[PDB]
Amino acid sequence: VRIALKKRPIDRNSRVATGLSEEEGDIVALKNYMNAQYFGEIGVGTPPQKFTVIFDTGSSNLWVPSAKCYFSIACYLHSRYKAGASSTYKKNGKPAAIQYGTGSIAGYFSEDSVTVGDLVVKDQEFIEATKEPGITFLVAKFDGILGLGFKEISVGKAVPVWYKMIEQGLVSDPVFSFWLNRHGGEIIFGGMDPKHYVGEHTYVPVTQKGYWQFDMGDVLVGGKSTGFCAGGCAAIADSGTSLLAGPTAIITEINEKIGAAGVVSQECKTIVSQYGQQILDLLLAETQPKKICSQVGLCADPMCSACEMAVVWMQNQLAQNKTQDLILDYVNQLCNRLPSPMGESAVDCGSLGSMPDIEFTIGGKKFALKPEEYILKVGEGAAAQCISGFTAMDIPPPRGPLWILGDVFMGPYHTVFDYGKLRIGFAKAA
């Protein structure tokens, strides 16, 4: 089954909105859909009521606004499910609400027949939004989210549309792929088109069944490592997002080498002066890095985090055999490129010429991303506005320091979410 997608590229209004707007656990509460660029259509009910939705590998719920949503100004800009105008409707008033990064939705469950392409998924239980506050839904160019993730992370434990279609007998292979590079795109449930990619797919298994997350490796920028992820890093291939979200340590090194704006951090300028040489010498003395911020006496917390990071940038500078006398002054500069959680990390659009391809190691393979794949342009030519397609998600501690690979990576790389073989696979997009 072939599901076309339309690409509505991030514009000026979403950036100003994202600008004027967690970690321990939930990545769902971390999602920002204003960073969505590919939309599809489904239909809930009989006859089919049409809704633009985001096909999200990073969520496991389907939800659409309810006709019963009277108070959110957002519901007055999006479509609504009218249960009574639907023959096949079954009422499951179980209340529910999902908190995401730039918004929230609360409503109650219900059921009906959902239609993707030409599959009529019956009994599909879903959430009708009786309220959906947040700026993500104010600016939204979609109506719902159709979750393509695992049931484990499903609100109210509802059975996803994929589980239903890939059981009721609707799909061929219990696989599905996204080709977000129709230079629009296209999802295909139960298969994949060998015309959407060059060569074979590198398959790495799903490590934690909840998210479509696999164990990735290192991140290199311009050939040089970032060190932080060399010892492994989790990743979630999420099609309900664009920007690549990773550790702040790595992102701050990428902004330097890429020339991305970045905000000035004082705690960092502080660890540099006050503790700079202490940390370095401890590293030169080959003291255990973990033990450094503890010995040096910094591990309140906000300062301990600037230190931990400082230590990591330093080990890589030493790891890259860089001369000591410059490491402090270097780590001092990164302190000026901290990822701004508001102001976009804008890059000069002409400066793409001298940018370094960054790469990620997955499956033993290094998947490169040229500067014209990882920098986004959001504006009017002459005065357009390019930005680093990276974000700082301070990797859910112990929930795995992780990356979220979306449109920016899944755009250049054909992704095949393999449910039967519980693994993901990447191929060069055609």
Please give the structure tokens belonging to residue 183: 């230079």
Q: Are 268 and 334 in contact (CB under 8 A)?
A: yes
Q: DSSP H helical segments within 244-381, as ranges?
A: 248-258, 266-270, 276-284, 289-295, 301-319, 324-334, 371-374
Furthest-apart CA atoms within the chain: distance in Å: 74
| Tokens 């990356």 found at | 403
Neighbours of 327 (CB within 10 A): 22
Query: 248-258 and 324-334 are packed helices; what angle lies between their axes, rounded to 10 degrees?
Result: 100
Beta-bridge partner residues of 246? 392
Beta-bridge partner residues of 399? none
Beta-bridge partner residues of 273? none
CA neighbor of 212 nearest in space, from 425, 428, 54: 425
263-339 and 192-262+340-430 share a CATH fold: no
Q: Which residues are known catalytic residues?
A: 56, 238
Instruction: Supply the DSSP string of 45-89, one letter for each residue.
Output: TTTTEEEEEEEETT---EEEEBTT--S-GGGGSS--B-GGG-TT-
Q: Is 278 exposed, middle or buried (0-12, 13-18, 19+ CB in 10 A)?
A: middle
CATH superfamily of 192-262+340-430: Acid Proteases (2.40.70.10)
CATH superfamily of 1-191: Acid Proteases (2.40.70.10)
User: What does the alpha-carbon distance between residue 241 and residue 407 come to, in Å, rounded to a whole number?
Assistant: 6
* Experimental technique of record: X-ray
User: What does the alpha-carbon distance between residue 208 and residue 82 come to, in Å, rounded to a whole number?
Assistant: 37
Please give the structure tokens belonging to residue 304: 């301990």
Instruction: Supply the DSSP string of 136-195, one letter for each residue.
Output: HHHH-SSSEEEE-S-GGG-GGGPPPHHHHHTTTT--SSSEEEEE-----EEEEET---TT
Is 1.10.225.10 the CATH classification of the domain at 263-339? yes
User: What does the alpha-carbon distance between residue 283 and residue 269 come to, in Å, rounded to a whole number?
Assistant: 19
User: What does the alpha-carbon distance between residue 167 and residue 263 come to, in Å, rounded to a whole number?
Assistant: 50
Instruction: Please tell me the number of Cα atoms within 13 Å of 395 on its side-chain side.
Output: 22
Angle at 230 between CA 225 and CA 234, to 5 degrees: 120
User: What does the alpha-carbon distance between residue 175 and residue 184 come to, in Å, rounded to a whole number?
Assistant: 21
State whether the Cα torsion 377-194-59-244 is positive or negative.
negative
User: What does the alpha-carbon distance between residue 35 and residue 28 come to, in Å, rounded to a whole number?
Assistant: 14
User: What does the alpha-carbon distance between residue 246 and residue 220 come to, in Å, rounded to a whole number?
Assistant: 13
Could you tell me the residue ranges of all domains in the chain? 1-191, 192-262+340-430, 263-339
Resolution of the experimentally solved model in angstroms: 2.3
Cα separations in angstroms, 321 against 223, 284, 287, 314, 325: 14, 11, 17, 11, 12
| Tokens 């209004």 found at | 13
